[PDB]
Amino acid sequence: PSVRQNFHQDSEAAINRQINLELYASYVYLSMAYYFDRDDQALHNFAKFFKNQSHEEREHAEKLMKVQNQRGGRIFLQDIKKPEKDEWVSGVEALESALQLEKSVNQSLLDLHKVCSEHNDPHMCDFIETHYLDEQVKSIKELGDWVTNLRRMGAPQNGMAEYLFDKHTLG
Amino acid sequence: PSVRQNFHQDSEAAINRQINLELYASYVYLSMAYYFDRDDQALHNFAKFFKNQSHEEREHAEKLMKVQNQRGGRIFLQDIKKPEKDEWVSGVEALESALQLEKSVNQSLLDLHKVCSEHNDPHMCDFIETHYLDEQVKSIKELGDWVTNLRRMGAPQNGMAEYLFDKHTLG
Amino acid sequence: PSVRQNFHQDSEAAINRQINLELYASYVYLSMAYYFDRDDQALHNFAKFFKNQSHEEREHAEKLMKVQNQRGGRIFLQDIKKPEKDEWVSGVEALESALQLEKSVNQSLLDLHKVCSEHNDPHMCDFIETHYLDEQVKSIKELGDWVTNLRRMGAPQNGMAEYLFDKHTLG
Amino acid sequence: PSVRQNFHQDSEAAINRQINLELYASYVYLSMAYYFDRDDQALHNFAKFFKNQSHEEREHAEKLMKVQNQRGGRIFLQDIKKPEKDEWVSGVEALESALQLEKSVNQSLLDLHKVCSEHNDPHMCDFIETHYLDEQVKSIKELGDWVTNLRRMGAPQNGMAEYLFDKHTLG
Amino acid sequence: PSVRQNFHQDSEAAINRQINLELYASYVYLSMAYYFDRDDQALHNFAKFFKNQSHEEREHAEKLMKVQNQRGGRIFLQDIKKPEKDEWVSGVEALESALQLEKSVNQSLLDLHKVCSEHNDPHMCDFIETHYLDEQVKSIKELGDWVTNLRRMGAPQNGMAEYLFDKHTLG
Amino acid sequence: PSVRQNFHQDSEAAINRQINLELYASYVYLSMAYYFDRDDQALHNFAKFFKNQSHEEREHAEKLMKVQNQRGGRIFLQDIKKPEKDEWVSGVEALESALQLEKSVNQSLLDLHKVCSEHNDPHMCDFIETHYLDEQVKSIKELGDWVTNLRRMGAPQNGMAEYLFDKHTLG
Ligand SMILES: [Fe+3]
Ligand SMILES: [Fe+3]
Ligand SMILES: [Fe+3]
Ligand SMILES: [Fe+3]
Ligand SMILES: [Fe+3]
Ligand SMILES: [Fe+3]
């Protein structure tokens, strides 16, 4: 591509991996959203939070697709794997699962940053710094905050805990 | 589920298939969108059309996920398969590929309607009629309209055809 | 200077080189702008694009002049060399020339980043990342997009191509 | 902490040092503010500038306290040492003292950046770049500008110099 | 100072002690604020209350610095001692600690009033009465109210107590 | 060119010389602007005046480029020579240097008018009269006014002179 400059095939390949992972995260969140939409779960603010997380992960993916094209890389999409579970058990356990997902995505972003840093690609390094790393830190901190509150309230055994958390923190 | 009533396992299973197909269509459209975002394609109104189609297919999927829960069915997600191509060749050829996709989705919707009709599920039949069948017919007609105009202008060999179509019809 | 801190003479010297290069780019763009203002060219939206690029390159230069003073460096201006051509031949060929200019400026910015990175000057590295690197990537991608469209339309031999591109993309 | 990821104890410890230093700077500025509030000094725009600097340094500290918690570090506060002087002698001499303070804070920030850079913590590196390094450069440049103007006017011996500077530059 | 009138060195010295104590209180509150900002505490309305208390104590200090200068006294700042704890254990226990702090500050204010009263300084006596004594009484009463409610709800053992108190009373 | 009429090659050549001179003046003013932006000069209203003069000289150049094309002449750009100095010593001395520059530009404009007048080109004569000659006279008078005020105040030896002039006349 006549636009390609200082853009290594390792960086290009790692961006394609990150694209698939962000789409994967979007899919996990979509699953969690409609799990709490079930009539036997019915925590609709949990559902709404997870649904919005799904749309945001989808935007995360598209911005990587955009920068791949901007730099002259070539997008190669892969299957979006179905999530590990069909049922997420409880509100606090879904959030704990989400925390592990965000930490895995974060580690993959840090690995992506290392690849671009090794190939002296400061455009990509700051693109990741600007658009992903602090977003990830904030998302992880928030999930940690929420898991702490839920567990301290006795969730999931305390049947009032996730109901009230859904009303107060998630509204 | 205590909400489940007049809802057959065949209908439930066919809804889960339709959910995956709508997500698949969303993924095909996402691929087409960023294909025309490439610096060696650069038909950004084609890209914008396909990007919006992707978001709409995603909404189509979520509404089926919603009605599955409303009726007491249980959502089972599957892998979202990557599209058949990585490159869609040209604007007119992508639209012709999109036309075949919409017709496949339409046939799967008609097959879904037949299943629900066989099990005398009028709620599901009218849900499909109201929210999907006319949308599908309109989408197919529109793609047919556009392919006709592009081919009559000589696309893709006429290099001016997709450029002007992108400016006039897709703006 | 009592403000100077962690600011190496290599970085200072490379900033002065970048200042002259940005001014040079401004001058090339000014030349291209009034070339298409000629009565025997008369692509006034090409002219207007290039004129605005010239003013923007001038701002790029002034921001480097500002950061040189902020860090306690000392500005040393050099001749602004006249462009390589007096005539840019055609709209598509001027844009292809502009693409090569932006890539040269981009490489000089990346070289500047490497100098500041070697001397562990994170203020300058992020100043370049924040204000120049993504701007450069976007400018290169845009020029690539436009050259692709023009050449696919047959420019410059197709006399309708640059006229219509001037009306649709450059208006 | 379940949020902690890629966060080294050296970085954590250096953040705690920076927190105390920013609070220290806030305290120095508070001292300078009410020094010029004295009836035998009575340069109230100097006082107002220094008072606002004190509040800003306090915000600088709190943002480091925030990022320490975001990353799962643990805040350890230390005594805020009283400033080196009780009396700052004159407007120009206080600003010269402030310049040395900002340069010391700047060097501690650069040392903090080096620690995080050594441990490949790009989140912290860009957090420092985004929120502190350019702020520091601008603050140092401004103090340098002002000291130059005051000394050229003959401050503090010229009794009119700090009075007029207080009215024109500090209003 | 030519402004000094009816202003005893004992009063001056006691004002300097009160200044340091108000700054100390500000520092204790800052510590409490970011303690509940921890991911393993995450009572953000507790954090926000304590953060605002910290800013208010800082204003309390500055108003004493102002009246010291107004009367011709001379400000002598001392170290701001770090708080007694790094961790405040729980919401109710932090508020109980805050109650003891406010009572200590209140007793120091009453001792300050006695000094000024002994030296027949009615300006200072009414300055303390107007700006500090009723503020202190209201702050103590409020903390007492809140501790009563928390303990009656079973805090900290009842994991729901501080969560709901944070939502209802502290929002 | 089919638009060329009553337009002599001497006039055309002299316009190209004037274009380069106006760009040269723009460059001198840019140098002066960031000279007073130095931390050891820091007369920011001098800097702002000179910066605006630079942009205006650039407009002067572009209007000559425009009229060259309007008349069917052909623009030939030359190197923009760096200014004679890197440092302009003081505010009053920079303005005295600017005065000599404006007088040189004025003489070149008068010489240009004589060329066009000799070739009986009344369009060009009135274009110069309308757009340049009175602007030049006003700019020279203003610089003369300012140098008179600065020198009468004792600039540059009187350190208060340029500071106050920067605040009163240049704000
Ligand atoms: Fe993400
Ligand atoms: Fe669909
Ligand atoms: Fe540039
Ligand atoms: Fe600071
Ligand atoms: Fe207080
Ligand atoms: Fe001029």
PDB file of N, CA and C in Angstrom, chain C residues 5 11 14 63 66 71 121 139 150 166:
ATOM      1  N   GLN C   5      15.633  22.007  30.910  1.00  0.00           N
ATOM      2  CA  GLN C   5      15.774  20.858  31.793  1.00  0.00           C
ATOM      3  C   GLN C   5      15.515  19.595  30.991  1.00  0.00           C
ATOM      4  N   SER C  11      18.160  16.934  20.368  1.00  0.00           N
ATOM      5  CA  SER C  11      16.728  17.183  20.230  1.00  0.00           C
ATOM      6  C   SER C  11      16.482  18.595  19.720  1.00  0.00           C
ATOM      7  N   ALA C  14      17.308  18.818  16.117  1.00  0.00           N
ATOM      8  CA  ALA C  14      16.341  18.129  15.267  1.00  0.00           C
ATOM      9  C   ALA C  14      15.018  18.889  15.184  1.00  0.00           C
ATOM     10  N   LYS C  63       4.029  25.556  16.020  1.00  0.00           N
ATOM     11  CA  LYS C  63       3.922  24.801  17.269  1.00  0.00           C
ATOM     12  C   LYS C  63       5.266  24.206  17.677  1.00  0.00           C
ATOM     13  N   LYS C  66       7.116  27.028  19.094  1.00  0.00           N
ATOM     14  CA  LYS C  66       6.658  27.264  20.460  1.00  0.00           C
ATOM     15  C   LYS C  66       7.303  26.295  21.450  1.00  0.00           C
ATOM     16  N   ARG C  71      10.917  24.720  26.026  1.00  0.00           N
ATOM     17  CA  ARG C  71      11.956  23.879  26.610  1.00  0.00           C
ATOM     18  C   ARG C  71      13.280  24.613  26.800  1.00  0.00           C
ATOM     19  N   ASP C 121      13.646  11.799  26.635  1.00  0.00           N
ATOM     20  CA  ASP C 121      12.901  13.046  26.748  1.00  0.00           C
ATOM     21  C   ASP C 121      11.425  12.716  26.553  1.00  0.00           C
ATOM     22  N   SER C 139      -3.377  12.326   7.296  1.00  0.00           N
ATOM     23  CA  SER C 139      -3.153  13.065   6.051  1.00  0.00           C
ATOM     24  C   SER C 139      -2.684  12.138   4.939  1.00  0.00           C
ATOM     25  N   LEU C 150      -8.941   8.880  -8.006  1.00  0.00           N
ATOM     26  CA  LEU C 150      -8.623   9.585  -9.247  1.00  0.00           C
ATOM     27  C   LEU C 150      -8.104   8.623 -10.312  1.00  0.00           C
ATOM     28  N   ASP C 166     -13.088  17.234  -8.197  1.00  0.00           N
ATOM     29  CA  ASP C 166     -13.030  18.575  -7.623  1.00  0.00           C
ATOM     30  C   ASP C 166     -14.397  19.013  -7.102  1.00  0.00           C
TER      31      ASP C 166
END
